[PDB]
Ligand binder design. Sequence first.
Ligand SMILES: Nc1ncnc2c1ncn2[C@@H]1O[C@H](COP(=O)(O)OP(=O)(O)OP(=O)(O)O)[C@@H](O)[C@H]1O
Ligand SMILES: [Mg+2]
Lengths: 57, 229, 50, 50, 49, 50, 232, 114, 114
Amino acid sequence: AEREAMLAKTAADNRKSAEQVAAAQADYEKEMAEARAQASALRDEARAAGRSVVDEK
Amino acid sequence: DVFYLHSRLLERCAKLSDELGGGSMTGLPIIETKANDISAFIPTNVISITDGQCFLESDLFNQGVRPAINVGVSVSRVGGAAQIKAMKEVAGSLRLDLSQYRELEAFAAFASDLDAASKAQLDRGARLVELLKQPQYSPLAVEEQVVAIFLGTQGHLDSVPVEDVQRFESELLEHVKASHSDIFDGIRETKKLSEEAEEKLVSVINEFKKGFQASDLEKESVKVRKPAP
Amino acid sequence: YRELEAFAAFASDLDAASKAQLDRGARLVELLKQPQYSPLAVEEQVVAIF
Amino acid sequence: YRELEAFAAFASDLDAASKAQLDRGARLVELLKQPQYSPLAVEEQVVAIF
Amino acid sequence: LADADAMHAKALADAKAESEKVTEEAKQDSERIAAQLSEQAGSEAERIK
Amino acid sequence: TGIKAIDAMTPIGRGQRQLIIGDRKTGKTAVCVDTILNQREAWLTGDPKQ
Amino acid sequence: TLRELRGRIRSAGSIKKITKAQELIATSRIAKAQARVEAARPYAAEITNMLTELAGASALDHPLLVERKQPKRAGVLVVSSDRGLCGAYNANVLRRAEELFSLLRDEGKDPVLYVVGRKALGYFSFRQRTVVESWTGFSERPTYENAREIADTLVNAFMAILGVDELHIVFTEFRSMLSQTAVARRAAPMEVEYVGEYSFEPDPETLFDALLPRYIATRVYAALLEAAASES
Amino acid sequence: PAIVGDEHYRVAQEVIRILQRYKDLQDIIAILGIDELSEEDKQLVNRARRIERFLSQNMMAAEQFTGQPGSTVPLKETIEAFDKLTKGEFDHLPEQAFFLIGGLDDLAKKAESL
Amino acid sequence: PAIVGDEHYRVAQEVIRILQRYKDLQDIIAILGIDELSEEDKQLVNRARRIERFLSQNMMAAEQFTGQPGSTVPLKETIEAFDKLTKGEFDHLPEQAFFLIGGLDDLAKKAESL
Ligand SMILES: Nc1ncnc2c1ncn2[C@@H]1O[C@H](COP(=O)(O)OP(=O)(O)OP(=O)(O)O)[C@@H](O)[C@H]1O
Ligand SMILES: [Mg+2]
């Protein structure tokens, strides 16, 4: 049973380590791009507010 | 005398010498071509009387190229002498580059074996064409123009998708105008894009590109030769 | 039928509806064909186009 | 030859007679070339075209 | 696998820090853009007057 | 002139004669009026040389 | 205007010459392709005959003859031209490929594409559909080596790598000299056909297993030859 | 855009762009047809033909000729329909559905008819 | 050939031959595409594009049109460069490398820059 579980762990770790490195890279990229998207939306909201204030004034 | 009529007129637009006061008169004669024929009589007369052309074509205007300058036919025989040194440095070969891009696009319309250099030229040309699009009643100061043309000529737009170039440009000049106006002030007062200012502008473009968000049934069978399985 | 026949001159195949349209159009063409100096009274024309 | 010239690119797909015609025509065209100020007596022309 | 856990946690922490920095810079640039547009509005109003 | 295409590819200098030539409704008067409008920043300088 | 019109006349005359030459050369290559289609007929007939004779004595448990318990991928081979000027040929082939995709999706199968010919590469790249493997440069003049390679790759994907539970082929059948129709065939797994009414070395089962890949290769070869004929 | 609005202007200029590109491809279409065009140009030509045919309308003065009653498409509906055409939302319908139809509801009705 | 020499005449007339053939082919290429030309014709078209662009020169009076200074190409160098182009010794360089260079040294420099 010990040999069996050892095989099982060798299998999972390799897999889970690979998948978790991939997931860490993907999640860092996703969070960074979400931050960029929020920044772009904020800048566009500022542009819209500026256009609105110039038009109203 | 129809030629004389125009020459007698247009030739009076001149840059007087310092002995005569240094004054000047710039002429922007406007000619209506019939059926896009720049090779007619009066058009060619005026073309030969003047120091350049801005051949606005309806085809390019419809294609979304506004102000619609046909780059190849258009020319300014004064050329760089009528540009500030920053603009001359940033756009010295821009017109010939765009003419070559148009020729390549006509040639490379259905060529599937494009070389790397040819495709790079096509991409740079498309980005420049987008960069030169400009809405009406939206003038740009000369410093903004040099920064914009700097984006394309030096290749900082090569990473932006074509359809976003107009936005990228439009945003960057604002980001500079709001945050790094020292570049614009340097260009305006000095009329030159100094090495220090060029480095600052490149760094600004890169830090903005970090934050820029781009818009992007028959069957095969084997006969077993027996009546049933 | 004119454009349908122009298309069918090189199309490999067409739907049964297209073939029916082509067959009807050929027949209408052969029907409107008329010999010279042989005008048809209006009722005869009505019957023919019928 | 002027009819076959369109097939110069695809000579491998031509009949042997047509390929021979194209090859003969190219050499005849080269034969009819002549440098300036160097006219040929009629006997020389006869041998050349021969 | 363990290192992977540590690297995932570090990547999440770095992503959070970089998101905070990016949003701070974005707020600063948005304030600058709003200031520029308000000054342009003042200039336009002066021109109209 | 305030237009990137003109000020970059076909620059117009003081003393030059630049022809704006084209068919109907291609942007000619737009170019010229934009050029006239772009001189307000210079007019406000109060300097005859500008 | 007159200058433009005469330039256009000269251009159109040159284009007419080129297109007429292409028409005649295509008439030649139709004959060549049809002759090569007929040349492969005896091999296909006799390999099919001995394949049926082996299936009579075979176990019929070879993977290529049994549907997977629940297929989830399906391979699709789209055979298309590698040069243009073929009219709707590529368009028709890829329209039938899309129809096959719809049929697979209705059945829940996810299609995965192998493509022969550049013109299909362009269409699938434009619509951003990934192609596992592609072959180019022989759609006009296919050779059995290319058919064998394509069949080998398809079969290897079938036995599996993620692999595919089913594999089809989409190509233009040369139904007649006047008409060519794009068709879809499920090349594997094959249905075992029974109809009413030999010795073997080294046994029937190993020989049958070794021969089925050859049958796949020869049928793909026939498909490529017939697609070349239809293209011409 | 200062007179008709941003959306109307954008849709009109996109339609003009598509039609001008279709006009540019006219000689190639005449000689070789849509088959030799690039896929982008092929899609553009399909929706250009559909746009050109959708610009046709059943005029109320034309009832004396074709017997078909005339339609009237409000400006908002025209803008929306042509935005959808330029975005390809209708490029699956047959070209015939757009002749002399005048509207979106009528377009759907004629699509059902075909 | 009796004045400018046999080498010069041969090179010039081969250049004219290539350019005339390219001019004739332009009609075919604009519609049928270059990929459907003969291999010899395709090679000739590439050489013709390179020759057309090499005939361009950065002139002294045109400095204010291109920014770059003027250049002078000796007659022997022109003959050698165009002879090589006509025999295809520069078919590996990109065509844009031949545009406004004026000489073989400038050709090599611009090829390196690309
Ligand atoms: N750069 C531009 N961007 C957007 N729209 C433009 C631009 N230039 C012109 N237009 C618009 O295109 C049309 C061209 O009008 P314009 O007055 O510029 O043309 P024109 O050459 O003077 O024509 P006309 O022969 O009718 O006098 C008008 O709708 C104008 O608003
Ligand atoms: Mg006007």
